Amino acid sequence: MDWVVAPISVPENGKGPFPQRLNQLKSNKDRDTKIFYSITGPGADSPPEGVFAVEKETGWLLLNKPLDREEIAKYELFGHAVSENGASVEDPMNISIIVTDQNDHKPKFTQDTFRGSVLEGVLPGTSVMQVTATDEDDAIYTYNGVVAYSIHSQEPKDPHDLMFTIHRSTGTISVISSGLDREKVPEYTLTIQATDMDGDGSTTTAVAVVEILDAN
Amino acid sequence: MDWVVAPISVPENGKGPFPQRLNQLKSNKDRDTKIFYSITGPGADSPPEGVFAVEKETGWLLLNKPLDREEIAKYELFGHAVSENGASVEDPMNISIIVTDQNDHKPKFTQDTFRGSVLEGVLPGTSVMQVTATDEDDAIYTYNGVVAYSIHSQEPKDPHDLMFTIHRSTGTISVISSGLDREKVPEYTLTIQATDMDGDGSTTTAVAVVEILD
Numbered sequence: 252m253d254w255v256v257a258p259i260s261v262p263e264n265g266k267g268p269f270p271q272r273l274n275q276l277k278s279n280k281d282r283d284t285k286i287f288y289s290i291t292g293p294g295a296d297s298p299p300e301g302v303f304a305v306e307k308e309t310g311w312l313l314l315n316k317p318l319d320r321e322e323i324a325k326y327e328l329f330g331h332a333v334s335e336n337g338a339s340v341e342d343p344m345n346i347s348i349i350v351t352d353q354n355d356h357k358p359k360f361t362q363d364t365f366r367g368s369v370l371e372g373v374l375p376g377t378s379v380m381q382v383t384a385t386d387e388d389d390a391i392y393t394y395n396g397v398v399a400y401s402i403h404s405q406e407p408k409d410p411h412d413l414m415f416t417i418h419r420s421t422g423t424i425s426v427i428s429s430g431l432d433r434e435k436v437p438e439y440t441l442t443i444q445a446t447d448m449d450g451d452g453s454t455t456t457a458v459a460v461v462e463i464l465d466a467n
Numbered sequence: 468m469d470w471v472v473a474p475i476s477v478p479e480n481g482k483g484p485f486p487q488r489l490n491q492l493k494s495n496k497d498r499d500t501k502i503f504y505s506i507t508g509p510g511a512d513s514p515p516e517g518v519f520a521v522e523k524e525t526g527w528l529l530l531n532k533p534l535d536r537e538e539i540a541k542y543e544l545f546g547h548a549v550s551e552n553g554a555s556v557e558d559p560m561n562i563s564i565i566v567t568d569q570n571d572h573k574p575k576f577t578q579d580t581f582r583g584s585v586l587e588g589v590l591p592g593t594s595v596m597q598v599t600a601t602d603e604d605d606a607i608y609t610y611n612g613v614v615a616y617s618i619h620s621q622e623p624k625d626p627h628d629l630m631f632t633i634h635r636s637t638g639t640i641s642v643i644s645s646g647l648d649r650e651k652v653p654e655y656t657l658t659i660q661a662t663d664m665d666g667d668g669s670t671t672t673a674v675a676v677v678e679i680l681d
């Protein structure tokens with residue numbers, strides 16, 4: 252029995268030590284001859300050179316230094332086997348290295364202060380504005396690049412304390428209660444937060460300033 | 468050409484979606500007979516049951532839910548190939564799942580306040596005390612569980628500002644300058660910090676109180 256395709260998943264920023272053994276190659280021609288192994292491709296003999304290597308006799312695939320997914324996320328290499336007589340015995344083998352993500356980037360708001368406005372009359376559920384934070388980490392297979400938005404505080408606290416809400420994943424801010432009155436309170440300052448790992452990681456902070464406009 | 472053996476490395480807390488394909492099994496007897504695949508072992512048919520599964524006809528190995536390395540770090544399963552009989556055609560295959568670490572734990576000092584003492588006479592380079600923070604994440608293959616120690620502040624700043632240092636990875640605090648005098652300053656309060664990812668991750672804070680003896 253065997254795998255049809257077996258890619259090797261390697262976390263970025265590994266401790267090693269280096270050089271670090273990955274998986275071991277084997278030509279089933281072993282008994283008939285002595286085999287010598289080598290590799291080619293971007294990562295081996297094309298740039299970036301010498302990130303990966305092979306032990307010529309044992310067939311161990313080696314990683315020579317820690318990887319950075321944000322720099323290169325995938326490698327496609329080829330492994331070769333030649334007899335002691337010098338003849339390429341079999342087709343070269345496809346080697347796929349998948350670099351898996353670590354949470355090595357903090358989220359960042361696109362601005363320190365976002366600004367929006369809304370009419371004093373509006374219905375609860377009305378969009379005011381949208382805020383945005385970015386995270387360079389993977390948000391598809393991991394949560395490391397997935398951001399959770401929240402409102403930390405509101406100022407002032409009148410009439411109600413919880414006048415707005417923020418959509419947890421889109422960053423759209425909405426009005427959730429009535430009684431907006433420009434004459435009483437013309438401006439609210441919301442301290443907003445974006446936290447990666449969908450709310451369990453690092454947090455960064457910005458501000459949203461909401462102007463209340465007079466409906467005649 | 469092939470791998471002698473090929474373990475599968477799966478990051479914990481994956482998004483999937485689930486069930487999630489890992490790698491695909493294949494018997495060489497595919498060509499001469501119809502094959503049905505299955506798996507056994509802790510993770511499959513022993514507890515924890517049904518974390519992994521196999522598509523009986525295609526041979527795809529499936530992960531049914533996200534993994535937690537801190538709960539189980541490694542699985543050893545066996546893959547089987549049987550004829551319509553139910554009879555093994557070849558030896559079962561060893562399946563190794565390695566669960567790779569995510570930084571899902573913050574570091575924590577063992578105490579909020581550590582206490583130590585040192586004689587007023589001592590030479591620079593003298594050990595005072597050792598402080599400790601733990602991190603449940605992997606500190607062997609990743610930095611996620613590796614802690615970096617630092618001194619944030621000293622009080623008072625007398626005779627001067629930098630009287631102690633902390634060893635970045637052991638948490639041992641040492642005297643780095645002379646002029647300790649109990650009669651002048653009997654006690655120092657150091658704000659200390661432990662940061663995971665060897666200094667690039669989350670930080671937590673505690674206090675070290677050092678008594679000067681006569």
Ligand SMILES: [Ca+2]
Nearest residue numbers: 319320321355
């Ligand atoms: Ca990186």
Ligand SMILES: [Ca+2]
Nearest residue numbers: 352353355388
């Ligand atoms: Ca990353």
Ligand SMILES: [Ca+2]
Nearest residue numbers: 356388395447
């Ligand atoms: Ca991140």
Ligand SMILES: [Ca+2]
Nearest residue numbers: 535536537571
């Ligand atoms: Ca975990």
Ligand SMILES: [Ca+2]
Nearest residue numbers: 568569571604
């Ligand atoms: Ca972990």
Ligand SMILES: [Ca+2]
Nearest residue numbers: 572604611663
């Ligand atoms: Ca950690």
